[PDB]
Amino acid sequence: SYVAHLASDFGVRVFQQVAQASKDRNVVFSPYGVASVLAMLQLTTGGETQQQIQAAMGFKIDDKGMAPALRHLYKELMGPWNKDEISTTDAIFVQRDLKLVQGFMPHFFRLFRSTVKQVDFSEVERARFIINDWVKTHTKGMISHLLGTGAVDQLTRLVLVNALYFNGQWKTPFPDSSTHRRLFHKSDGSTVSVPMMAQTNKFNYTEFTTPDGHYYDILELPYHGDTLSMFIAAPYEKEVPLSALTNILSAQLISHWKGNMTRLPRLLVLPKFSLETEVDLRKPLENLGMTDMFRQFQADFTSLSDQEPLHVALALQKVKIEVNESPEEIIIDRPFLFVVRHNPTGTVLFMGQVMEP
Numbered sequence: 204s205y206v207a208h209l210a211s212d213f214g215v216r217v218f219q220q221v222a223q224a225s226k227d228r229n230v231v232f233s234p235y236g237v238a239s240v241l242a243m244l245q246l247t248t249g250g251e252t253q254q255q256i257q258a259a260m261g262f263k264i265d266d267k268g269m270a271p272a273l274r275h276l277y278k279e280l281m282g283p284w285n286k287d288e289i290s291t292t293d294a295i296f297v298q299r300d301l302k303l304v305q306g307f308m309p310h311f312f313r314l315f316r317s318t319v320k321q322v323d324f325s326e327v328e329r330a331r332f333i334i335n336d337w338v339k340t341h342t343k344g345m346i347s348h349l350l351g352t353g354a355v356d357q358l359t360r361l362v363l364v365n366a367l368y369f370n371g372q373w374k375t376p377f378p379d380s381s382t383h384r385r386l387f388h389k390s391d392g393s394t395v396s397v398p399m400m401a402q403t404n405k406f407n408y409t410e411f412t413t414p415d416g417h418y419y420d421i422l423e424l425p426y427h428g429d430t431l432s433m434f435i436a437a438p439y440e441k442e443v444p445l446s447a448l449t450n451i452l453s454a455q456l457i458s459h460w461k462g463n464m465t466r467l468p469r470l471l472v473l474p475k476f477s478l479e480t481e482v483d484l485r486k487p488l489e490n491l492g493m494t495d496m497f498r499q500f501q502a503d504f505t506s507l508s509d510q511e512p513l514h515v516a517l518a519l520q521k522v523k524i525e526v527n528e529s530p531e532e533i534i535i536d537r538p539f540l541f542v543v544r545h546n547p548t549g550t551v552l553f554m555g556q557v558m559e560p
Contacts, residue, residue: 301511338364
């Protein structure tokens, strides 16, 4: 609950930076994933670089109970309920001949039960294949390549990678016969015909307002066994842009949505979608004050290596999400937000904006 809230809150702020820079385009992100990999990165840092990450994340990984709570949290998400629905991997890749500080690798293993991977970036082609093969095998083949590693070269010394895949099984699947093409209204006033699923049920529903008073619908769709849920949020009026909701998101608001829901009979019409995003985390993390880690002489990675100059050459997140089939109407025929939440802990696992299914 506590680290899940810290992780979720920080990751939702990174998502807002990504969505604000990517207006009118589809975006899928993992708040949990960016928090998990940055929590690991905290152990490699010192001085102002460490202070900037800790101030942005709101916690210190070395504080008593934090690393055990994140380990416990990771176990709860990899539990028996997960029927090849969620796949996640975090990896820190460092140059092989780089003199590491004594005590770094055993301390990293003590807290994370994993290692920082050592690769020879001088063998550029091979370093690129290793990173891709690491992501492929730890996502059960669902994410097989990162395009951002096309910038990996002989000078690269430190790469941060996070990859996640999600395709959940609904508690109540959408009937296959009810799916048909409907007009979706894009934010630029144009229309596109897309396959839209339909289901008549008692849905957890609530209505909230933006600070300017615009109403927006929030619907909850549980996955099998009620561990995970998908939240769908969209403004009632087509003239209200989706950014009005995205600009006010937080881990606290999502909990408040769930808390205020009541089960109501509705015909829900929802577009099918399959989305993939690969995002360079540099600009969103700099906007949240983590500037030093990406600068050659400012970056302080002395807890990892106190011999040579180190900086993060590349920080990437790659996410793939699939949404398919397995009375007053609610038609989601305009851009909308989605949130995948682990309800027992409150972890925001996925977040996205669907501008065009």
